[PDB]
Amino acid sequence: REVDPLVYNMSHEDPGNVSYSEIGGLSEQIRELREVIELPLTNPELFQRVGIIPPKGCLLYGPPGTGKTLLARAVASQLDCNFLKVVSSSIVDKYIGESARLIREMFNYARDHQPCIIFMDEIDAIGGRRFSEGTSADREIQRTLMELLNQMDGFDTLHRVKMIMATNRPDTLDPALLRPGRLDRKIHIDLPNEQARLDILKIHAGPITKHGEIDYEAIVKLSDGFNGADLRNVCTEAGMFAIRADHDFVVQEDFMKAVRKVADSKKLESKLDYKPV
Amino acid sequence: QSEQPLQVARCTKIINADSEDPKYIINVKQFAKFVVDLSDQVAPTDIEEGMRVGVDRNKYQIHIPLPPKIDPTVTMMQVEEKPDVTYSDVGGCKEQIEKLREVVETPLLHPERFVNLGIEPPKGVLLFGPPGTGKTLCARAVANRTDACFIRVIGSELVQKYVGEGARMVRELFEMARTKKACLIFFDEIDAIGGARFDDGAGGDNEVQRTMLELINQLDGFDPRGNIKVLMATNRPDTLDPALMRPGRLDRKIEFSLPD
Amino acid sequence: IDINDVTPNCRVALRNDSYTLHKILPNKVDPLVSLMMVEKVPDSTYEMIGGLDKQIKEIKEVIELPVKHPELFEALGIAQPKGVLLYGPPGTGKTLLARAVAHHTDCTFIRVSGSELVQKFIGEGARMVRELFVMAREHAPSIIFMDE
Amino acid sequence: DVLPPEADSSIMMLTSDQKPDVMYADIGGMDIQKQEVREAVELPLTHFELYKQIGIDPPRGVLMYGPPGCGKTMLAKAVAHHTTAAFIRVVGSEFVQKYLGEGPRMVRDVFRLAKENAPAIIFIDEIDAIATKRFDAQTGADREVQRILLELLNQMDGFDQNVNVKVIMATNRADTLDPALLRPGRLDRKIEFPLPDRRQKRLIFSTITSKMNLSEEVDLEDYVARPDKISGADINSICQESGMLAVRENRYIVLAKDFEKAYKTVIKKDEQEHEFYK
Amino acid sequence: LRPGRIDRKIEFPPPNEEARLDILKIHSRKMNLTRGINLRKIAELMPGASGAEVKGVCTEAGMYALRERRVHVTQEDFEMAVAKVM
Amino acid sequence: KIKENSEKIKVNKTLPYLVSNVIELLDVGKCAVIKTSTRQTYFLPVIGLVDAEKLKPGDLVGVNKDSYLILETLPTEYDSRVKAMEVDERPTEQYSDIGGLDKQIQELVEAIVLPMNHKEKFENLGIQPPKGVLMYGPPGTGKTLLARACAAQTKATFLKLAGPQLVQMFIGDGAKLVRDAFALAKEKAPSIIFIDELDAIGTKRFDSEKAGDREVQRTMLELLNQLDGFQPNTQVKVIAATNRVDILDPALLRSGRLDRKIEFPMPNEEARARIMQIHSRKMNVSPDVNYEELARCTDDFNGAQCKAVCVEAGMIALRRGATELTHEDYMEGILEVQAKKKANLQYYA
Amino acid sequence: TLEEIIDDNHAIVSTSVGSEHYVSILSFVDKDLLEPGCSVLLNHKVHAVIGVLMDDTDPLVTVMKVEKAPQETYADIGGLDNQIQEIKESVELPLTHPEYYEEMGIKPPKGVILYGPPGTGKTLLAKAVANQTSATFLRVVGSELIQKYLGDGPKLVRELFRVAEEHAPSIVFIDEIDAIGTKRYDSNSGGEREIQRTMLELLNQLDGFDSRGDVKVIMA
Ligand SMILES: Nc1ncnc2c1ncn2[C@@H]1O[C@H](COP(=O)(O)OP(=O)(O)OP(=O)(O)O)[C@@H](O)[C@H]1O
Ligand SMILES: Nc1ncnc2c1ncn2[C@@H]1O[C@H](COP(=O)(O)OP(=O)(O)OP(=O)(O)O)[C@@H](O)[C@H]1O
Ligand SMILES: Nc1ncnc2c1ncn2[C@@H]1O[C@H](COP(=O)(O)OP(=O)(O)OP(=O)(O)O)[C@@H](O)[C@H]1O
Ligand SMILES: Nc1ncnc2c1ncn2[C@@H]1O[C@H](COP(=O)(O)OP(=O)(O)OP(=O)(O)O)[C@@H](O)[C@H]1O
Ligand SMILES: Nc1ncnc2c1ncn2[C@@H]1O[C@H](COP(=O)(O)OP(=O)(O)O)[C@@H](O)[C@H]1O
Ligand SMILES: Nc1ncnc2c1ncn2[C@@H]1O[C@H](COP(=O)(O)OP(=O)(O)O)[C@@H](O)[C@H]1O
Ligand SMILES: [Mg+2]
Ligand SMILES: [Mg+2]
Ligand SMILES: [Mg+2]
Ligand SMILES: [Mg+2]
Ligand SMILES: [Mg+2]
């Protein structure tokens, strides 16, 4: 059976070497994702004994920059079973039926290599709501979506093939896609809380050569409403202040300036609390 | 029996562009892509990596460089027959005529008086006023009196059914104007596509705002706009985008107020 | 082949090399026939209809008489009626009676619904709904039926 | 030459292995839908003589419309498992092919295969992938979809009585279907698959939990008797998450604690419903 | 509604009792009706129903005769069909 | 017989080739499953004249027309639209040509240039350089002008995308454009990518039950993933520019995609005077010009408006014909650039 | 199709399959009536431009043109004496006696609006003018101008007025022009603003840059 060059590179993309130690506030979410992915594919008889078929689909949904793609990269790097990387917008092709054919080939490759995971980043590129008055392009993309839905939970059952789908606009997804049978477990990668912000800030300031006493608690207190990428940018801006001052290190004054700068930058955002259903 | 037909392709890449025997990747539209070489009558420098290569059949090599593609809709916009209206048929707007004449004609007639003082003449005008004041009349007078390529465009002619088709033809219009040495473009009824961008919540006017933004970027962006001078005729100069009204794109706003 | 027999919208065989019309094949399915086959309005008759006899009488007048007897109206001195509208809740016999009267009068019953699935049959570049009138005139007498 | 009418791209299911493992016992509830699908697809395939003798005209096409997760494809799987007639499954999205003419060819092939293997049941999942009502000639993809849909209509119209081929179609969004596909005639009947009532929730809970090993303290009645509009897929998700929690705690018996946590984790639709409107 | 276009406006109200009886007779002509069925009684039992509903009643009476494996549609089948449809 | 073998090989390898792909590379001894631009899939029992272990699924190859045997490996495909939007003839605008923007320059220059030239600072401080620089500004100011100055003074691979260039029909296009642009920037040496008029592509997503801007949303999503997604691209820097960030999607403004969200202000009095001088340096300027007076008169002239003041002052001089401005031609230019509609308000006290 | 003309004896012709052959144009063709978008006859083997086409008109042209004289006449109208006089002065008189206008030194009115309550003889005078006039009568409606896809409304307006010029002298009668306004339809993708752009296209066609030929506009 043919393997498309697309599906080949999908399988062979390098997820860096991200470890679970590089993810902060996400501990419950990490273990839910691992529950869905790893354990059913390593000890598939515990769930048989309990009398269930383990969940198949995960929806990592949350505000931008909360760590969905980082978590997906960590899973891809730290698990062994076959893995298929794909951005849902890089499946779309202008030819007739080409996108649906590509999705069919994705699932055919997954079934051929039985223990497999399929990660679709920013699924709302394809899995958007279906229009009752859309254009021809919208109808083609909806054909692609419905091919995907049939592949997940259509007539032919899926065995040992798991789905992960990352999004930050889950409200726009098709209800058939968000259905419990297709995307079984919808986990919310929410904005870091106090302890999550502390953990992320420590993670991203560990390699920075600090030469003072760092009230990470004060930085976290001023980082209310931030995301993980915002905290990484806080570290980067503290470093920027260091270079601009011509210093080969960082201090708490720099960190405070950086966090206030990022807080000011946050004023240009919009609604972020988007939920499914 | 002597001029063989040539299928039009596009030179995608020039493998080994050095003096060594090069190879050109052509893409015969909707037919196929090939690696080919030049005819011995065609100089290497005559062909770039984006020109319409124009290759023959049968070992696709007999080259003829060929100009950029222009949509028939866009190319059927040059004013071939000049309007029968003159500047003497417009009355009561002497100062408006003087300003519009300056901007559109005088640089295109006596450029020496401008390069002597080192001035960049204003390149962009917005004739705005109530319904019926001499806006289209003055546009027709300019078209009649001008010795240059006059391209009329109607705001409603940039509304097209497929996403990116309005901006596509804006790009084609401006690049055709660029190919021509001295061009006046005239967007009449510019209210159609030129409107202030509003977020809304249902994505209304996204396509018209995209084509307007393409026009904005073509008027003043990361590129020398060329020797193109633009007219914007409107009777609702309150919807036009602030970016469109910026004096980097509409330098010489003229008001066709009701005559005294 | 007499060129007078190659009237537009007819299938014809063309020789492989140097295309040359050398036979008039059986005519393609009429676009109206295809459109009505797609719409699939069930055939009806007055005997299938029951319970609306005064309504049968009125529709009979206004549809049958103008096309069969266009002399009663001329003698009366009134323009032939050309528009009928049928009030009534769903499934009370409006389409049934329209189809029955068309069938009995022998008028070609053209069901207009606005579906884009039949727009190629009406006309490929159908930017106007009046383009059905060429078909209606060709298959006249015609009854164009709309349903809300 | 003329080939045997078995040339086709859409092959029947090899009932030896491709047959689904679902059953009318595994479904549970939805007896109205089960009976309607029976009388539409299964009875006329072994009693068409009785139909003709009592004066009924058997239908071809049932359309199984309804919300997502209510049991359309599951009932299709059960019908495929139990039926003793040929079964040709296909997805509406599979009929759209790059090669122009393929897809009308595929529709012809599926219907020819069904006719030559009669009694047969065709099953098109997500019919609204090709049965949409808005078509934009001048786009190519929609022209091909129009050709596919018209070929499908022609095939179903060309099935006179005495032919044992029953069409079944599935769609979450039936409002977007073209009315012609549903047109009174030998084109379609309609069955609804709505969100189950409270007693249907009870039946689905019972059937899904019969396969698990619950502790005697569960009392699924408390969960059944709640004011939530949740599908059979939602009930399966609730039971599945309860089992997942039991596995997490390393137990092989599911507890009321597990079911409580699973229900609160799965049915999280609670939001808004402002109290001043009532 | 301008009084110059719709040359005639006909009204198809919901069928009367007699109209419902006529519709029921027409739509039952096409089934095995056991001798002596009170189609008038069925029409009376189904008031305020359209011809489509009458046809559905006939079809469901046939379906009930099918469910009780039998060759002739009967009064009981018509009664149950009316009850189910309405 | 090396000579004659090479002669036969060259005879078979004469142009023109048909360019195909290497979609699959099977082992049976290695064989190819190439797909050729005539849209034809041919299985090659013998790969051909190119090394088998140099071909990977999807790469572009040259093939004999008739034998369909791979003859060469060709460079990667970049839409002639993504190659035509690369800067070859560099702009010429020193930072001195910029007016009231000094902090904004410093910020951009830092975030873009410094990680390119002085990466050692970042490495020794243990920092990740800032990724994206978004230049908000009112319809005026110096966003595109600063982009031009950066492209002129950077000496790197500059790729000017513009917004409405990436919005196409033929679903998949636009996303392909963005992918090709970022891939070209990646293959080239250190490179900047300038998104002119970002709001054309980055408009916020919405939920709609009847219709929506789904294709542009998909292209924006591809851009989002390219900026900060599964595959880190730390060698291609991105500077976007826009007039309305209230339009842009939140996922496009997040840190990691566009972290230095610079804001270009209305020029102050000194900034306006400096812009006047910058655009009057090349004219025949009179020695009595109170540029501070002109700046005070400007009063919220934002961007070009000052250049337009200078140009229209030159035009006003040109009416008479002279070598002078005498801060009356500039006064008239300010008057005619204010664009105040004519009125007969001379009855005011 | 003829995509573009490069010079005499050369042109780019798009074959039905999409190929874009750059080919010579022989002396046979008039080197006239050739504008981008036109149909062209191409030699099968060499694809040389050897003829032109479009001798047929489009279904839109056929439907718009009134290839008939309505039986109603000015004598069949009673009471609209002044309205008949003015509409005649606008549409018929300049066609039957251009000498009056040419000697007076004025151009006739370009358009006329027939405005009145629901039923007063507006379309009746349109019918009478069509019956008596020697110009080609093109009838359109406002709801008939309201199109479905974005850009179809303006395209239809442009096509209608181009047909009017091609068949000039012509009278373009737009009945119920307020239908482009008052009525709202879901088929219209763009909606109110696409309606506005269609109206703007009508504005340009009625009085815009392009010089009109002999096309008198009646609008009810
Ligand atoms: N929980 C976290 N712990 C550590 N780093 C985080 C976390 N969340 C985000 N980041 C940082 O954010 C950047 C990557 O974010 P990521 O791509 O995972 O976001 P996302 O949630 O998928 O958002 P988007 O909706 O924009 O795609 C990296 O800098 C990563 O370090
Ligand atoms: N100032 C003027 N001098 C002479 N004729 C004029 C003048 N203004 C209008 N006209 C007459 O009116 C017509 C010109 O109007 P024009 O088409 O230019 O209007 P416009 O200002 O562009 O309005 P619209 O908003 O309706 O497009 C011609 O008939 C011309 O004779
Ligand atoms: N009535 C039911 N009884 C038991 N389980 C059910 C029932 N309905 C649905 N399910 C469960 O839901 C899943 C089956 O969903 P199915 O594919 O039948 O949905 P559908 O109604 O066709 O919807 P869609 O088209 O949105 O996928 C399986 O988990 C099945 O266990
Ligand atoms: N601070 C400044 N110093 C010098 N020239 C300036 C300045 N601000 C604007 N300009 C002038 O503005 C014109 C170009 O403006 P530019 O393209 O930079 O605007 P922008 O910020 O991209 O805005 P937009 O595209 O919304 O109109 C040039 O004349 C440039 O000289
Ligand atoms: N007056 C009637 N007599 C007999 N049958 C009727 C009558 N009215 C409706 N029907 C039946 O109802 C069904 C649907 O009627 P239909 O023609 O759709 O009515 P409408 O056009 O008002 O919806 C038809 O199958 C028809 O047999
Ligand atoms: N003198 C008249 N005044 C008004 N209506 C008349 C006159 N003579 C005839 N009619 C009738 O009026 C109808 C035309 O009305 P019309 O002008 O179309 O009204 P509207 O256009 O406002 O709907 C025709 O059916 C015609 O027979
Ligand atoms: Mg992500
Ligand atoms: Mg005008
Ligand atoms: Mg299903
Ligand atoms: Mg700019
Ligand atoms: Mg009228």
UniProtKB/Swiss-Prot annotation, chain A:
Modified-residue entries (Phosphoserine), positions: 132
Please provide the record's keywords in A-Z order.
Answer: Acetylation, ATP-binding, Cytoplasm, Nucleotide-binding, Nucleus, Phosphoprotein, Proteasome
Please tell me where ATP binds in this chain: 62-69
Leader sequence segment: none
| GO BP of this protein | ERAD pathway; positive regulation of inclusion body assembly; positive regulation of proteasomal protein catabolic process; positive regulation of RNA polymerase II transcription preinitiation complex assembly; proteasome-mediated ubiquitin-dependent protein catabolic process
Q: Give compartment(s).
A: Cytoplasm; Nucleus
Q: Which GO terms describe its molecular function?
A: ATP binding; ATP hydrolysis activity; identical protein binding; proteasome-activating activity; protein-macromolecule adaptor activity
Q: Name one GO cellular component term.
A: membrane
> What does the function comment of this entry state?
Component of the 26S proteasome, a multiprotein complex involved in the ATP-dependent degradation of ubiquitinated proteins. This complex plays a key role in the maintenance of protein homeostasis by removing misfolded or damaged proteins, which could impair cellular functions, and by removing proteins whose functions are no longer required. Therefore, the proteasome participates in numerous cellular processes, including cell cycle progression, apoptosis, or DNA damage repair.
Family affiliation: Belongs to the AAA ATPase family.
Which protein are we looking at?
A: 26S proteasome regulatory subunit 10B
Identify the species of origin.
Homo sapiens
**First and last residues shown, out of full length:** 113 to 389 of 389
From Swiss-Prot, chain B:
Q: Which domain of life is it from?
A: Eukaryota
The record's GO CC annotations read: cytoplasm; cytoplasmic ribonucleoprotein granule; cytosol; extracellular region; ficolin-1-rich granule lumen; membrane; nucleoplasm; nucleus
UniProt entry tagged with the keyword Phosphoprotein: yes
Q: What induces it?
A: Expression is not cell cycle-dependent and occurs throughout the cell cycle.
Instruction: Tell me where it mainly resides.
Output: cytoplasm
Modification N6-acetyllysine, positions: 29
Q: Which GO terms describe its biological process?
A: osteoblast differentiation; positive regulation of proteasomal protein catabolic process; proteasome-mediated ubiquitin-dependent protein catabolic process; ubiquitin-dependent protein catabolic process
Does the keyword Nuclease feature in the UniProt annotation?
no
- Quote the PTM field: Monoubiquitinated by RNF181.
Q: Provide a Gene Ontology MF annotation, just one.
A: ATP binding
What are the binding positions for ATP in this chain?
Answer: 129-136
Purpose: Component of the 26S proteasome, a multiprotein complex involved in the ATP-dependent degradation of ubiquitinated proteins. This complex plays a key role in the maintenance of protein homeostasis by removing misfolded or damaged proteins, which could impair cellular functions, and by removing proteins whose functions are no longer required. Therefore, the proteasome participates in numerous cellular processes, including cell cycle progression, apoptosis, or DNA damage repair.
Identify its protein family. Belongs to the AAA ATPase family.
Tell me the protein's name.
26S proteasome regulatory subunit 7
- What organism, scientifically named, is this protein from? Homo sapiens
The taxonomic lineage of its organism, from the top, reads: Eukaryota, Metazoa, Chordata, Craniata, Vertebrata
UniProtKB/Swiss-Prot annotation, chain C:
User: Subcellular location, in the record's words?
Assistant: Cytoplasm; Nucleus
UniProt modified residues of type Phosphoserine:
18
**Which of the residues bear the PTM N6-acetyllysine?**
120
Q: Domain of life here?
A: Eukaryota
Tell me the residue numbers annotated for binding ATP.
88-95
Q: What does this protein do?
A: Component of the 26S proteasome, a multiprotein complex involved in the ATP-dependent degradation of ubiquitinated proteins. This complex plays a key role in the maintenance of protein homeostasis by removing misfolded or damaged proteins, which could impair cellular functions, and by removing proteins whose functions are no longer required. Therefore, the proteasome participates in numerous cellular processes, including cell cycle progression, apoptosis, or DNA damage repair.
Describe the protein's quaternary organization and the partners it interacts with.
Component of the 19S proteasome regulatory particle complex. The 26S proteasome consists of a 20S core particle (CP) and two 19S regulatory subunits (RP). The regulatory particle is made of a lid composed of 9 subunits, a base containing 6 ATPases including PSMC5 and few additional components. Component of a complex with USP49 and RUVBL1. Interacts with PRPF19. Interacts with TRIM5. Interacts with NDC80. Interacts with PAAF1. Interacts, in vitro, with the thyroid hormone receptor (in a thyroid hormone T3-dependent manner) and with retinoid X receptor (RXR). Interacts with ERCC6.
UniProt family annotation: Belongs to the AAA ATPase family.
Q: What protein am I looking at? A: 26S proteasome regulatory subunit 8
Its lineage reads: Eukaryota, Metazoa, Chordata, Craniata, Vertebrata
**Full-protein interval shown:** 103 to 250 of 406
Curated annotation (Swiss-Prot), chain G:
Residues found modified as N6-acetyllysine: 148
Residues that coordinate or bind ATP: 116-123
Per the record, the major location class is cytoplasm
Q: Where in the cell is it found?
A: Cytoplasm; Nucleus; Membrane
The record's GO CC annotations read: cytosol; membrane; nucleoplasm; nucleus; proteasome accessory complex; proteasome complex; proteasome regulatory particle, base subcomplex
- Annotated S-S bridges: none
Q: Which GO terms describe its molecular function?
A: ATP binding; ATP hydrolysis activity; proteasome-activating activity; RNA binding
Superkingdom in the source lineage: Eukaryota
- What membrane topology does the annotation report for this chain? Lipid-anchor
Q: Where is the crosslink of kind Glycyl lysine isopeptide (Lys-Gly) (interchain with G-Cter in ubiquitin)?
A: 127
Which keywords has UniProt assigned to this entry?
Acetylation, ATP-binding, Cytoplasm, Deafness, Intellectual disability, Isopeptide bond, Lipoprotein, Membrane, Myristate, Nucleotide-binding, Nucleus, Phosphoprotein, Proteasome, Ubl conjugation
Annotated signal sequence range: none
State what this protein does.
Component of the 26S proteasome, a multiprotein complex involved in the ATP-dependent degradation of ubiquitinated proteins. This complex plays a key role in the maintenance of protein homeostasis by removing misfolded or damaged proteins, which could impair cellular functions, and by removing proteins whose functions are no longer required. Therefore, the proteasome participates in numerous cellular processes, including cell cycle progression, apoptosis, or DNA damage repair.
* Record family assignment: Belongs to the AAA ATPase family.
Q: What is this protein called?
A: 26S proteasome regulatory subunit 4
Which start and end residues of the full protein are shown? 111 to 330 of 440
